Amino acid sequence: KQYIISEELISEGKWVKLEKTTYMDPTGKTRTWESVKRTTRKQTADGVAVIPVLQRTLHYECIVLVKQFRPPMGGYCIEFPAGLIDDGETPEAAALRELEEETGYKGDIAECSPAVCMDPGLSNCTIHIVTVTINGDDAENARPKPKPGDGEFVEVISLPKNDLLQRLDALVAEEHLTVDARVYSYALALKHAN
Amino acid sequence: KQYIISEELISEGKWVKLEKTTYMDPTGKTRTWESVKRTTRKEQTADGVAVIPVLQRTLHYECIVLVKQFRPPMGGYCIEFPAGLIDDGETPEAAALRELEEETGYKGDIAECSPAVCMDPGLSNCTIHIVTVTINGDDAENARPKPKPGDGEFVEVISLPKNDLLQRLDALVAEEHLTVDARVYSYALALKHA
Ligand SMILES: O=C(Nc1ccccc1)Nc1cccnc1
Ligand SMILES: O=C(Nc1ccccc1)Nc1cccnc1
Ligand SMILES: [Cl-]
Ligand SMILES: [Mg+2]
Ligand SMILES: [Mg+2]
Ligand SMILES: [Mg+2]
Ligand SMILES: [Mg+2]
């Protein structure tokens, strides 16, 4: 019943553009929205976020997260490993590659979401969330070698899955970091389950 | 180690602006980023709230209450937690309970409130509180919940059982063109993984 009529370019940078979207509301009234989009895209989604479940025998299962300076936030953020899917990459292979570049861990695909929206009220950005298990007892994940690209500076933070929410709240309280909303949502639901 | 050096306005719509952010990398080199901000954030902890609304009713399984709306940035319908911006001088909790009532008709009770968490930290400074609210669906107020949507708000309510949320989201996505929000999907995955 609602649909897009027209999009006007307001401003196009190298990575990000701003548009004025004209749309028809359900009453038949024409309305405008300021929208952000990535400047270029081919793929199912722009991206993947990886939920990396570090499994080591006789240890608590851990969720592997990353801490990086985020210039739009002006500070440090705790996030699932994540990056853009390359032209030609499957979401799954983008997931293993990012996880390896960012954390040094080599993992196994467990499941892969459909494309899900990051911030549908601002952007059109979408990602696949990819659940990956990491056999922490395997020799390749003994001394994980993080292979960061140019301009990535990633700190790795493993937290126990059974206390994730309390551990993140502790990090926020003491380290003045911002936790990512997907990470927090995941952590909440681990507590809210049954 | 890393910090912002300057923020230069590239373009400023009524609601969203684009900025060229210059920051110091951890090697001591200057880099830039393109950042999105809102134009009207007041002296508050976070822009907005998303509500995790747990509908509780005797001899019913708990439901997560979700909303479906047309999102002009996305060019389509999205399934999301009820959500909105925090008004000047409004607390996160008041905003959560008010957006929930406006969008769904339900009157909730606060359970918990997250710190400010980042929506898409490689793009914007946007942050939200994720507020968990229980809804007593046995209370007469919550019997025939009538939405009070504001001007230009057009929201459908969808209540899904907590105990099957991920499969139920998958069935909705299977039946139509519709994107699930990444927070909702992250929360449904954790419910499975617990
Ligand atoms: O790429 C973005 N987010 C993201 C990508 C991969 C994984 C996780 C998050 N947001 C964005 C950037 C530039 C223009 N519009 C939106
Ligand atoms: O408002 C935003 N997100 C949001 C707000 C409330 C609840 C859920 C999500 N993002 C945004 C908008 C304008 C400029 N930059 C970012
Ligand atoms: Cl798992
Ligand atoms: Mg990354
Ligand atoms: Mg990366
Ligand atoms: Mg809303
Ligand atoms: Mg609203």
Q: What angle do CA B149, B183, B152 make, to 5 degrees?
A: 20
CA–CA distance, A34 with A76 (Å, rounded to integer): 27
Instruction: Write out the E strands in B13-163.
Output: 16-24, 30-38, 48-56, 63-71, 76-80, 83-85, 109-113, 117-118, 127-136, 155-161
Tokens at residue A32, please? 């405008």
* Long-range CB contacts for residues B90-94, cutoff 8 Å, separation at least 24: B92/B45, B92/B46, B92/B49, B92/B129, B92/B131, B93/B131
Among A160, A162, A157, A154, smallest CA distance to A175 is for A157
Tally the domains of chain B: 1
Task: For chain A, state the CA radius of gyration.
Answer: 19
Tokens at residue B85, please? 């911006």
CA–CA distance, B86 with A49 (Å, rounded to integer): 27
A151: region left, alpha or beta (phi > 0 left; psi from -120 to 50 alpha): left
Among the partner residues A34, A74, A194, nearest to B4 by beta-carbon distance: A74
DSSP A176-191: --EEBHHHHHHHHHHH
- Which residues 6+ apart lie within 8 Å of A78 measured at CB? A65, A66, A67, A157, A168, A171, A177, A178, A179, A180, A183
Report resolution in angstroms: 1.7
Tokens at residue B9, please? 């306005």
Structure determined by: X-ray
Closest-CA distance of chain A to residue B141, Å = 25
- Which residues 6+ apart lie within 8 Å of A95 measured at CB? A48, A50, A107, A109, A112, A128, A130, A132
Among A43, A34, A38, A52, smallest CA distance to A118 is for A38
Burial class (CB in 10 A: 0-12, 13-18, 19+), B191: buried
CA–CA distance, B152 with B92 (Å, rounded to integer): 23
CB-based contact B72 A20, cutoff 8 Å: no
**Which structural domain range is residue B41 located in?**
1-194
Chain length of chain B = 194
How far away, in angstroms, is A43 Cα from ligand 1 center? 13
Rounded (10°) CA dihedral A147, A148, A150, A151: -160
3-state secondary structure of B166: helix
Per CB-CB distance under 8 Å, the chain A contacts of B114 are 184, 188
Q: What angle do CA A96, A97, A99 make, to 5 degrees?
A: 65
| Residue whose structure tokens are 């899904």 | B160
8 A C-beta contact, residue B80 and residue B66: yes
Q: Is B122 in the pocket of ligand 1 (CB under 6 A)?
A: yes
3-state secondary structure of B85: strand
Backbone angles phi, psi at A91, to 5 degrees: -55, -40
Q: What CATH number should be reported for the domain holding residue B170? A: 3.90.79.10
CB-based contact A114 B180, cutoff 8 Å: yes
What CA–CA distances, in Å, run from A4 to A21, A33, A59, B179?
A: 7, 10, 52, 16
Closest-CA distance of chain A to residue B112, Å = 10
